[PDB]
Amino acid sequence: MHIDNIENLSDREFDYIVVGGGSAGAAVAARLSEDPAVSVALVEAGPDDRGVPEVLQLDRWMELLESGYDWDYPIEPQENGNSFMRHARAKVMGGCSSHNSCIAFWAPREDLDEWEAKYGATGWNAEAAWPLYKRLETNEDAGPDAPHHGDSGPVHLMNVPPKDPTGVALLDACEQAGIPRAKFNTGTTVVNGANFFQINRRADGTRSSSSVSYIHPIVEQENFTLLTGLRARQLVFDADRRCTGVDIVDSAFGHTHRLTARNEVVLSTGAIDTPKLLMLSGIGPAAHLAEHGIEVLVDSPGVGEHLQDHPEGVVQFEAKQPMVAESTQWWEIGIFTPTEDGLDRPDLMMHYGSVPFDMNTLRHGYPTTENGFSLTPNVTHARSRGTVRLRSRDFRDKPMVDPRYFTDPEGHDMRVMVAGIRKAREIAAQPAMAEWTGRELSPGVEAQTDEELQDYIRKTHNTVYHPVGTVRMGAVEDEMSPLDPELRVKGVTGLRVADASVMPEHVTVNPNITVMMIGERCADLIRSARAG
Numbered sequence: 241m242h243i244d245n246i247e248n249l250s251d252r253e254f255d256y257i258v259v260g261g262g263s264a265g266a267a268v269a270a271r272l273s274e275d276p277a278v279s280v281a282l283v284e285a286g287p288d289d290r291g292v293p294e295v296l297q298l299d300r301w302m303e304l305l306e307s308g309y310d311w312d313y314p315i316e317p318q319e320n321g322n323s324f325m326r327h328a329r330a331k332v333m334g335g336c337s338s339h340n341s342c343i344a345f346w347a348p349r350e351d352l353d354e355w356e357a358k359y360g361a362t363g364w365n366a367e368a369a370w371p372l373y374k375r376l377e378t379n380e381d382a383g384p385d386a387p388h389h390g391d392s393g394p395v396h397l398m399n400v401p402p403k404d405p406t407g408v409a410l411l412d413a414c415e416q417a418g419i420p421r422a423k424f425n426t427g428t429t430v431v432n433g434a435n436f437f438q439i440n441r442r443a444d445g446t447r448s449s450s451s452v453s454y455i456h457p458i459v460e461q462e463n464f465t466l467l468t469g470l471r472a473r474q475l476v477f478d479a480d481r482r483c484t485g486v487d488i489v490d491s492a493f494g495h496t497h498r499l500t501a502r503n504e505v506v507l508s509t510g511a512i513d514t515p516k517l518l519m520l521s522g523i524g525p526a527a528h529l530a531e532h533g534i535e536v537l538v539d540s541p542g543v544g545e546h547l548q549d550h551p552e553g554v555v556q557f558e559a560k561q562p563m564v565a566e567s568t569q570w571w572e573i574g575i576f577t578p579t580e581d582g583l584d585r586p587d588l589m590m591h592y593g594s595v596p597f598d599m600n601t602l603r604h605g606y607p608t609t610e611n612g613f614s615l616t617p618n619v620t621h622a623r624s625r626g627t628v629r630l631r632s633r634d635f636r637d638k639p640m641v642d643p644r645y646f647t648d649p650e651g652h653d654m655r656v657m658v659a660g661i662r663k664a665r666e667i668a669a670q671p672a673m674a675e676w677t678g679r680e681l682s683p684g685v686e687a688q689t690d691e692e693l694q695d696y697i698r699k700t701h702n703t704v705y706h707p708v709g710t711v712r713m714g715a716v717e718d719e720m721s722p723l724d725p726e727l728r729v730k731g732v733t734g735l736r737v738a739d740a741s742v743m744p745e746h747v748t749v750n751p752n753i754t755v756m757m758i759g760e761r762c763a764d765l766i767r768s769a770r771a772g
């Protein structure tokens with residue numbers, strides 16, 4: 241059952257409590273609940289999404305940013321980036337799989353195999369992931385000549401039909417620039433290729449969010465309790481350092497209530513909120529906790545460290561003809577291309593949007609339009625590393641999020657981004673786009689030198705909205721990895737984390753489907769542990 245008033249819940253004890261109903265957390269709770277002998281609670285600070293058309297209808301997703309469904313995290317001042325940038329994060333069942341543009345990718349096998357081979361995370365490789373991406377999806381390309389794909393899973397993946405004539409022309413321009421059309425999600429990584437995306441959307445226009453796909457079917461299930469509108473303020477531990485449950489706060493008076501777990505708590509509040517909850521709960525860098533008056537239960541110095549993202553630039557053009565008035569999600573094409581030789585994954589990706597994107601350019605005086613399109617280059621393995629830290633001991637205060645954009649010492653991220661703006665220009669200038677590409681509105685053709693393009697990037701960049709890696713998994717003996725390879729929080733028992741916080745290195749592509757696969761894997765790890 242769904243409980244949106246804690247006063248109506250009499251028994252506050254469960255076998256498992258999953259905190260955060262987002263991409264991973266919805267997957268973990270649904271899968272755990274498939275054993276009818278265990279009880280599962282899923283606790284989510286935002287509201288239920290059932291019946292909320294602006295969340296459910298994918299083509300409305302742009303309206304959600306900065307609304308009441310967005311926690312809206314500003315960043316710390318940036319040494320070499322855009323201090324006005326905001327990390328939008330959904331506050332609603334489904335988490336960010338409920339606010340995003342549903343671009344759906346399997347991660348490159350080369351990214352996943354490196355989690356075990358290079359970063360110490362035993363058992364995390366493409367062998368472990370592939371059957372889980374298969375189990376979670378119902379893909380339109382499934383069939384016996386593509387046996388890796390799922391045809392039965394709860395998350396529906398479909399091909400964006402090629403209806404936007406500007407997008408067809410842009411892919412024709414990609415081909416003229418030496419970037420062929422490529423099929424996505426075949427299991428073979430695309431290093432140089434472009435196409436319309438696969439999106440996790442249902443045939444009726446509803447986003448196949450983790451809440452739509454995993455939770456809506458099971459709300460009334462006997463052993464399942466969904467609690468919305470309830471915000472966790474700390475995890476609690478007995479004198480054995482065993483996690484016994486979570487303290488949550490209601491929206492009426494801000495009273496604190498305890499939910500208790502007999503077996504395990506899984507924390508899935510995402511890459512910004514998870515490290516903050518662990519630190520509030522005494523698990524984090526000792527001197528940082530002591531400076532906020534928090535008693536250190538585990539000195540765990542990698543909590544909040546290693547923050548990674550896909551930083552993003554934009555090139556905006558005025559369109560020479562009326563742009564499409566309807567769309568699946570307004571950002572229907574992706575282009576991958578390598579900026580140097582010898583790579584087995586592309587270092588550069590770009591999105592094509594059939595809209596302008598002036599959120600960061602208008603304040604610096606760049607001209608804008610109501611009829612244009614955008615190309616957004618992003619660095620796929622940015623080398624910069626940032627932090628999520630407590631702003632105070634009060635759980636109500638937003639944390640300090642400092643991605644340290646464009647600070648890596650070799651200057652890789654700024655180099656790939658400058659190459660990305662040039663590449664976007666070269667694509668838009670091909671003869672197949674000649675009836676569409678009008679004047680370049682940002683940065684504008686006056687910006688030509690590396691220095692002019694770097695200044696533009698520093699002032700106007702955004703994010704593809706993909707923060708990961710702040711509570712990473714790694715080797716049992718690696719003290720900078722807060723989790724072991726079974727996603728258990730080191731130094732306590734009964735506590736795992738499953739969300740985008742766990743990645744030891746960013747993936748090449750948009751990460752949502754991989755985060756759901758992390759939730760699927762966490763459920764399998766728990767169910768195996770329960771058997772013993």
Ligand SMILES: *Cc1cc2c(cc1C)nc1c(=O)[nH]c(=O)nc-1n2C[C@H](O)[C@H](O)[C@H](O)COP(=O)(O)OP(=O)(O)OC[C@H]1O[C@@H](n2cnc3c(N)ncnc32)[C@H](O)[C@@H]1O
Nearest residue numbers: 260262263264285335336340343472510705740750751752
């Ligand atoms: C924001 C965003 C993300 C995004 C995107 C567009 C935007 C605007 N476009 C994407 C796309 O088209 N394709 C893609 O592959 N990824 C895209 N992204 C990112 C992807 O959505 C995110 O990386 C992914 O969803 C993260 O999943 P994860 O499970 O790590 O985190 P979450 O969905 O944010 O879920 C966390 C939940 O926890 C709740 N919460 C947070 N704090 C609390 C407390 N204290 N108590 C209880 N609940 C809490 C959140 O409300 C959220 O529901």
